[PDB]
Symmetry: D2
Subunit: 296 residues, 4 copies
């Protein structure tokens, strides 16, 4: 099986005058590459998938692919949708425009059954010939991909090689790798990156790495080298910033932090996302003071 693992960043999407700032997007991706990141994920939840147009979603995949040329860094394109026909179209676009793989979030809002989830992902995997990583985040979608469904998809479909888990459920992470140890479990919760890696997870798809790419990369690579002491030391040091980046719904805090660090020009969202409360803005600024934030 082809795989995409290691330290990965769920990229924020910067706006200027309501438009995607395509030149700041490329600059932010190069900053990730230059700080030890193994792959980048354009247009996930962190990238404001919901409020981009279909053209804008596709444009950001192209920029990521272009920016990573000549490097070892891969593009795991965000291509999920709650409509199977939309998700297949995004999968085919990413394949035909040079992405190395795709991420595929579980359908949100319409709550498919486990059978429907299996048929949803089977259609996606049959549409392309590049790796497909499942993405489970029940707090946002309203549904859960069960362990049985995940494992069945891993064994029945060639391109499906693992799952990104954002469920705060370490028991399920043990369940997954105890019954299918060949799968690639990827952490989708920054605060518990180390516990997932220490149980055999093979990477992270990170919000914090937008701000601190070198620290997330070092944490992951320490763990992959079985230097558990050093990986845990970074995970413990990062807890305070990992928590404050979710005081409000992601990506509101991380964009606030990137703005306070001078890495994005303006603190701009697309509705229904908005600026954080003045209280939480001050809380984020205060937590940041304990970390050394790399520039460009």
């Amino acid at each position: 099986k082809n795989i995409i693992i290691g330290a990965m960043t769920a990229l924020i999407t910067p706006f200027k005058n309501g438009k995607v700032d395509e030149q700041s997007y490329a600059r932010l991706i190069k900053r990730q590459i230059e700080n030890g990141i193994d792959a980048v994920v354009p247009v996930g939840t962190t990238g404001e998938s919901a409020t981009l147009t279909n053209e804008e979603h596709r444009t950001c995949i192209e920029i990521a692919v272009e920016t990573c040329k000549g490097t070892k860094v891969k593009v795991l394109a965000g291509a999920g949708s709650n409509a199977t026909h939309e998700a297949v179209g995004l999968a085919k676009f990413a394949k035909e425009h040079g992405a190395d793989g795709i991420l595929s979030v579980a359908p949100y809002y319409n709550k498919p059954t486990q059978q429907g989830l299996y048929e949803h992902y089977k259609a996606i995997a049959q549409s392309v010939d590049i790796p497909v990583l499942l993405y489970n985040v029940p707090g946002r979608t309203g549904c859960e991909i069960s362990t049985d469904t995940i494992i069945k998809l891993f064994r029945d479909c060639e391109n499906i090689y693992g799952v990104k888990e954002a469920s705060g459920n370490i028991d399920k992470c043990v369940d997954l790798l105890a019954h299918e140890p060949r799968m690639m479990l990827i952490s989708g919760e920054d605060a518990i990156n180390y516990p997932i890696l220490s149980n055999g997870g093979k990477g992270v798809i990170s919000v914090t790495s937008n701000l601190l790419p070198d620290m997330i990369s070092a944490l992951t690579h320490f763990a992959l080298d079985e230097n558990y002491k050093e990986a845990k030391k970074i995970n413990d040091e990062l807890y305070n910033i990992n928590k404050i980046l979710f005081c409000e719904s992601n990506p509101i805090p991380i964009k606030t932090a990137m703005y306070l660090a001078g890495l994005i020009e303006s603190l701009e969202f697309r509705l229904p996302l908005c600026s954080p409360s003045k209280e939480n803005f001050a809380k984020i600024e205060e937590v940041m003071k304990k970390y050394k934030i790399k520039g460009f």
Copy 2:
């Protein structure tokens, strides 16, 4: 200039017994001629309003063109009758929801339903700005829609009341949260709003506390019973309304043994009201066990034909 005193300024409303219409498919396309026939069946069985393309209508998997087409068919079919069209126009992107709202206005809908943004979990401030922009885009009634089990977010009682008091067109909320405490909270602090039940099994408890209508899944199958329940309740004949709500519990519950609208489409198919048990992925046929369970509950109810 904006202000905070819209509560008692005359708000156009859409209340009574309302149906969240299923969307029939034929060879993967919207069966536009079965859609019109089903809406006419609703009109002839005492329903006061219809809601095209909600969650029950598989809004998520329809294209933008198909979503707009189904609103047009509903508007056309209810012309010359007392039945209103409350167009489903929600989106998790504010610019999409504004575009749908303006479409519904410009093509003759009587009002709009607007679900709270799903998946991206906006803050209460974000929800306020989301709804504020939608309501300022049109001049027809806007009913908020709270269903946290599907969206991942909740519109607070405080936010709902602020929107009611700050914007002219927001006139109430459809609640699908299984939280009768919140329903008491809403009408005790803002009794001028229209609380609409979005949970069939508890239609009567919501109406008995001052709710003014239902937006029902069960009425797809049994429109006469849901309409009679509501009109009994609106006339304060609570004994007869409760008697029907009790009779419908078994079917109200079994219609969610799997995720709506999988059971209701199965039942409409078992009743001969649609030609195919067709969904758009990721939705699918129910399990064989749940199929039998649905068939088996239906037998105790009288289902009106065409």
Copy 3:
């Protein structure tokens, strides 16, 4: 069946120098009788069941029985326990000492199965010949008595006549009375007293009635006569105090309010229960100013 319905009060237990103030207990119950209450419940959760000794628990049942002699008010003695042999002993004491019926909370902490709950209540009901009211409060016990178990118990044991529901689940209340309309459903959540009664419930067991017995009494009797408009008006007017009485864990706010109204001499709890925060103390006082509180 023989039943105990209507407006009922979950009595607070006052302490004086670390012992139960038995003369304040009697004075408080007499205040309930004179303000339209139909029954009183000694030693529930509100009465600090957990921290009373077995002798004090039994003494408090005795005081309630004595005080309601010669009146229309009944005593529904609190007799629950998470050990069946303890719950049987309390039930038999209540019977032998003149209680009109018993309330029996579902076993807490040890989480029995539905089969175990059935055997638990069957042994209790067979031990006495007075009415037994089940009590479901999953947020405190960790278990739920299923609708099926409640209906089975109602139909299989002669003296079990209903359930007190404190689960915030109006769907379950419709389920209960649609499938077994002969049972007595009793509200155990003050804020939704009117919605439960309007669906056919026949009474409440109230925390707020400790402070405002006349208002809860009028609400219940209005509703039982199908004067729903007048009952809803009181339920709506009581929402603010109904909510603030749970700003902290019951019975901390209600005992605070009774002290703030001068109805008890000292604001004393038994650890692990404690006085509320300074802020919540002031918040309860401010909500109270909007209500008419009867004295002695």
Copy 4:
């Protein structure tokens, strides 16, 4: 601080004819000592604390103390209660009768505030001079000891040295040891024993070790010696039995399994606990067949 760490067993309490089988209890403890277990915990939830009399609870502490005398195995006596005066009395008994420390579950059913929890445990810790381990299990108690309260108690009272966590929340486990790495975090959920130990936890209090003391012992000692690969291997191999032992509420499955293994003479509980369902009886019987169960 004095501490009690390592691989520990939450002992089942066998009954025979409705009484505690005191000779089987001692025999079971000797089996634990002989399989590398570092300490035993009499009368927890697994020991049916709720349904034992005050005298039976105290007797089982005495049997554990006597059976482990002259050996290296410690006794961490279960002494919790939802009434502070009861918990202090149990704590003093354990001290006066030779226990090495005490475990003290957070108060169940009456839901104290964080301030009440602090005063509850401060009173317990001041009553004795032996180590005190807190016990958080919100699914059974209805309350949670916050990270702040645990750390404050650890820093303010000499005897309080850690917490047994049974909340399925690895984020909280990272939170605890990142802000107070000197405390002893003890796993209270068998399925995730290895992830908690891999983050710096120093022991387990196990249900599964009743049946497989050698395997739980080996898992813990592998982890404490930083052989993470071998500890994970055992944790992964134990997942199936760890899960089936909670198909129904603990200790119903574990007693069933001990009965099926011939380690106790009768499968009898005290109401409200009861035998499992017939299908669940068969399910436990299977999972056991994949494991090698040591005898006496």
